[PDB]
Amino acid sequence: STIEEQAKTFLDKFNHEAEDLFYQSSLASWNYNTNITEENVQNMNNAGDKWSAFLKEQSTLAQMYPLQEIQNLTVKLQLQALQQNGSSVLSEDKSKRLNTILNTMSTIYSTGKVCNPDNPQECLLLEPGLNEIMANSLDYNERLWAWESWRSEVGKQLRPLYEEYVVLKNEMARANHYEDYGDYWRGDYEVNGVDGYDYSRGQLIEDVEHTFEEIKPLYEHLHAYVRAKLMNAYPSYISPIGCLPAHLLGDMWGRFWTNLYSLTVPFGQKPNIDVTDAMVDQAWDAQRIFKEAEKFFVSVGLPNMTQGFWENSMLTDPGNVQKAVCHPTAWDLGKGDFRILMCTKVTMDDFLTAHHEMGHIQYDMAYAAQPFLLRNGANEGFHEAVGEIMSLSAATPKHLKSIGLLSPDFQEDNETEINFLLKQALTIVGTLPFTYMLEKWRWMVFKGEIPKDQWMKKWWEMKREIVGVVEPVPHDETYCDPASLFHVSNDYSFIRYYTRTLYQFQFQEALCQAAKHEGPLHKCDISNSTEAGQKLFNMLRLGKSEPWTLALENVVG
């Protein structure tokens, strides 16, 4: 009964009560999301505040078991997850000021408006209307106007708020023994005391910089090709040896290059595979899509759906008036309640999103036997990677022609393969330099290596050097161009998009070999192979029980 058995007895009671309260809160939130009313809002808010209060109470109660004499690594993991103060280490004045600036930055980003210089009564927001210009337009002057005015009229309002946000977050982080907010964020990949699978919080920077060094030869050739193809759409504006102007890239920031496909398609006379009309001509409905997805998942040896999944899920848009947030998600309400919320049409993209979301559902069904605190991916990048490899495998012509959506012969050619691979590289590869550079800038800013009178100087230096894009108008220290992105002004970490992109492919390569694939990797289809299902299930069922370096080894080696 020394100090350890008391911790176990405490954790049992916590598990029970937290499971109940979490089910209640999640059910309320689901009810609100699938049926938007007024009463539902406060009905969900009540359960939410109750859950948050219970969590804070248990967190403060759990400090009375020191972490030093607990020997079981599972108990230590749970107690360490429950003991973290987070905020509330600050004063009351300071905490309230922090929440105020967070909400102010979010509201500035959400409702900022810019309008025409020649008709000032025509103001456009960002979402419906600015990043439509940026995605569709081909007018150099209009793109430049949108790009400049968004950063000049809304970006400049976030600078004095971000400067304060940095200080307050750094204080909150150092009061938990972390040296800055950047280290607090990197603390998600840390492992301690396993003797073979350890991982430090400062090693992540080294791994990121050492893996990025091998992508530069491919990103450089993609950059050169895209520059050569853009020199025909905007002649006399691009230089054949310089960077790319930052407003010609496909959206407001250049995060993905996926909208330059129409300009840079290799063989424009070969339309790529699109089994959409073959679906409507075969009378496919929202239920047939998910039945096919479930059959695909059972093919590799994974279980069926839970039979409550078919009754409680909202697979179609509710017709008359039942307004719901039509955003596809997988819900894990708890106690064995798995659901899917999406308003599916009959297309090809929804045929892939079905697989992507049922991947999440299968991950959730896998580790449902773990203690409540240890139900999540091994780290922040595992869940979406497990989701993405499913849509990767289910969109190959070998799978589509075996379902019945392609002609039984359908001779393929290498030109269509190049079309497909370039459409993929404009999204997967075009976003790795951006992600790396942005998170590097934020790390160096939180650390103090960039004084606050050199933020924009270093931002655009690193943009010209690492990413390879140049600004069309000089920006002094009255701007804040980072904060004009959603993840920067809404306080989200950004490295989970870099690591996931890697893990994803690793998983695929480890699952292609178990299924004994022969040709190129981009033609893999893991269906009908149970060894791949087993290699995947050996990692899905761990949750956070084991360090992420171990779970990764259970698949890749």
Binding site: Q6, T9, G336
Partner: protein, 198 residues
């Protein structure tokens, strides 16, 4: 002939909790096992001592019917030689068990939208239970070394909790009604047992 009143311990409109399980002793009568075996799917029907087929030619002194309600994934614990929060603090079966067990799903009966907190179970206790022991005490379990004087708080918890049964649960978190029969033959020459065809 007075038949066995199996129609009550099976049709009880309100079952008992697992920490306080119901026990009904059946006296000298004729035992009709053919009313339940032909009855229903019976998600669980496991017989250990006798074979489930020949209940109609063997006889025993008296039979006990123990009735309660547990979660779905705890039915596996109702078996001789099992460990768990149910087989340790709520209901125990001796390894030389001679009766048998049956269980079925009752989601449409014992579950209500909003929570059915009328079903309890004990998850804290000082020591394991003995075979067929029943404990209803509500003393505040003391975890640490400091006495807690009959109040809840740090290192002293309430020993009983509730199944928040709801209809939107998964098989395994849903209510299951369990009835276990237990046979006995001490010395009685002529006792209650099954019927013969005449």
């Amino acid at each position: 002939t007075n038949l066995c009143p199996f129609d009550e311990v099976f049709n009880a409109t309100r079952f008992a909790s697992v920490y306080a399980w119901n026990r009904k002793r059946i006296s000298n009568c004729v035992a009709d096992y053919s009313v339940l075996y032909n009855f229903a799917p019976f998600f669980a029907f496991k017989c250990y001592g006798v074979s489930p087929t020949k209940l109609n030619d063997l006889c025993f002194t008296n039979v006990y019917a123990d009735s309660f309600v547990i979660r779905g994934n705890e039915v596996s614990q109702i078996a001789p030689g099992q460990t768990g929060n149910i087989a340790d603090y709520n209901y125990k079966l001796p390894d030389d068990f001679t009766g048998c067990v049956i269980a079925w799903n009752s989601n449409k009966l014992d579950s209500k939208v909003g929570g059915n907190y009328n079903y309890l179970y004990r998850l804290f206790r000082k020591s394991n239970l003995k075979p067929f022991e029943r404990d209803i005490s509500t003393e505040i379990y003391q975890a640490g070394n400091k006495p807690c004087n009959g109040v809840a708080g740090f290192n002293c918890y309430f020993p009983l909790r509730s199944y928040g049964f709801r209809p939107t649960y998964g098989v395994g978190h849903q209510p299951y009604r369990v009835v276990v029969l237990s046979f006995e033959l001490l010395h009685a020459p002529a006792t209650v047992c099954g019927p013969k065809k005449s």
